[model samples]
Target: TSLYKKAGFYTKLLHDGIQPVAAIDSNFASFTYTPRSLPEDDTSMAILSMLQDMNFINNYKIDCPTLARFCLMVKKGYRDPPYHNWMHAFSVSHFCYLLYKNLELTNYLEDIEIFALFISCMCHDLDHRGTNNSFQVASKSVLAALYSSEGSVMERHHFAQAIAILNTHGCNIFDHFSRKDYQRMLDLMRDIILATDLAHHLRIFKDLQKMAEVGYDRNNKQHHRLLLCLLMTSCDLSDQTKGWKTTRKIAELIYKEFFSQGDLEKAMGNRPMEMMDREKAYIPELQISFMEHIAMPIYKLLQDLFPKAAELYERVASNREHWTKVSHKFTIRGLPSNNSLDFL
Candidate 1:
């Protein structure tokens, strides 16, 4: 139906049963497991391996070649940006995999919901242009013109792109699903993808807090929505849960994208936000505020809902402490020429 044909190469590769050069480590399901260690080519196999580990492939009757083509198509959909590229998508999906493996997510959610969550993670930021919603609306880009009226311009586009891939021949992994089940899957995917918008998270945060306080109810529809949204956000922001070195490296990648957007905004005769403005922004302070306000609270909420997730919260807390220490002695300009965090 489109110029973007199915991934016949991946279809052949998967049909021949290619294996990852290195096996997934024993700690693959742990929060401490780093996806960075894997070679880039192995990412697809790792995703497949994780799906098999979850029993989703057999349970859902997914065709391996169809799934491979779909994953590759989704990967091709992402443009190269510092933070929101395919690597980011893979990492987020891996975090969701960890949640399913370690958190006993099956106890609280239905199988259909789990399947949707994983798919949503992979497709959540499809075709991200490095710029955010504010920039999209400010620049009056095509995407903004199309979706700004409804808000969540970028997220809506991401969901649309996800559908486009599914609609492509040989890329519909859910083809075997019953009509009603397929409808529900897409419905859940839409909601979950849209929930990745941080503004949407802020709007629902109080409700999320209330849900955690009152305890999760498996039968409550509202709780189900809240939990899915929380999990999506958690997976999206899972970079902060890593050790200081990895967390600092990710911060650099994020700021690289943000500062590039800032450069673009300046070229358009607009002033960027402080966090985006490389000249004025102080990385340590910005990271401190981000962790304290956004990252920590999310993990705290997750820990509250699932006590076993306390280690994630603890790791973020330790990273925050590292940032706090650096804030006193560091300014963005004062950092070493290479922007190394060896001092930490």
Candidate 2:
């Protein structure tokens, strides 16, 4: 297909299986600074590769075509939106994969839960339109008309898109599960996907904090679910978990996405917020506020439960220092700026 063979995209498919979880800067220390490799080649082998390795590790029996089709369809489903496209999804899922292996989250979480978590991470932003929920409502886009009745407009659509992919021919990755178990997995998947909404972040953070204060119990299902939500949110914003060069690159892509929407809003005679307004946005200031208030607090609380998660907090702290320095040099008059510090 012409779409699949576009210049760099021919290499997108993962004919060569992806490196093992241990192979790609295997340990926490190295992964902390490692920048992303292969930002182009839209076949999104990184996503499929990580998922394939996970299936091997966990012993889930999914056939190659089914898995490939599902992943390919997922990649196709994503609009060519700036930040929330397949690459962003790949990055988020890779972070989840890293955290899963590093912290041995699988040991504490059931295989089914791990499966659901990673899939949720991979598909969380599926089909995102680059613009946000508020934009949908303000623009009165069809998605808004269909979903704004219930909140989490874009998220609901993403979840629906995920379901559609899973149901496609040969893509029933969960077909091996008993009907009852499959339904349960989908229910949990839904919960995890919807949890990515920032609207849910505050409540999830508060609940996780309370659990941390009292001591988390792995035996409690609610406690496990709460932590999983935080984990996905962490991965969703995982760009903040890298060094300056990596972080700066991701920040640039994010603002590119934001400003594109801002352009649309301006064309429509609507005013975008400072953060969305490229002309008006102060990238450093926005990054600082988000890191200090949102990203840092979550990592701090996560470290309380999983001491190994301290590495995540540590990396982001380093990231904040770099941004702070850059902020001193740049100014909304200023603008914004991932993977391997290695790539740097």
Q: Identify the leading candidate in terms of TM-score.
A: 1
Please give the distance, in angstroms, between residue 244's alpha carbon in candidate 1 and its true position after superposition.
0.6
The weakest ten consecutive residues by lDDT in model 2 span: 1-10
Question: Which residue segments of model 1 deviate by more than 4 Å?
Answer: 1-12, 15-22, 333-344
Please report, as a residue range, the 10-residue window in candidate 1 with the lowest summed lDDT: 1-10
Alpha-carbon local distance difference test for all models: 0.86, 0.74
Mind giving the per-residue lDDT tens digits that candidate 1 earns over 179-230? 9988998999999999999999889989988888889988776778899999
* Shift in Å, residue 116, candidate 1: 0.4
* Candidate 2 lDDT by residue in tens digits, 1-344: 00112112222344665555445444422455343564455335555566666664247767666676677777777766656777777777778878866787865677778878888887998878788899999989888999899988998898898988888778787777788988987888888888888888976677778888998776677777888888888888888877677777777777777877887889899998888886787777788888898989888887888888898899888899878876665633434332111222
TM-score per candidate: 0.93, 0.87
Residue pairs clashing, model 1: none
Off by over 4 Å in 2: 1-30, 33-35, 39-45, 55-58, 332-344
How accurate locally is residue 221 in candidate 2, as Cα lDDT from 0 to 100? 77
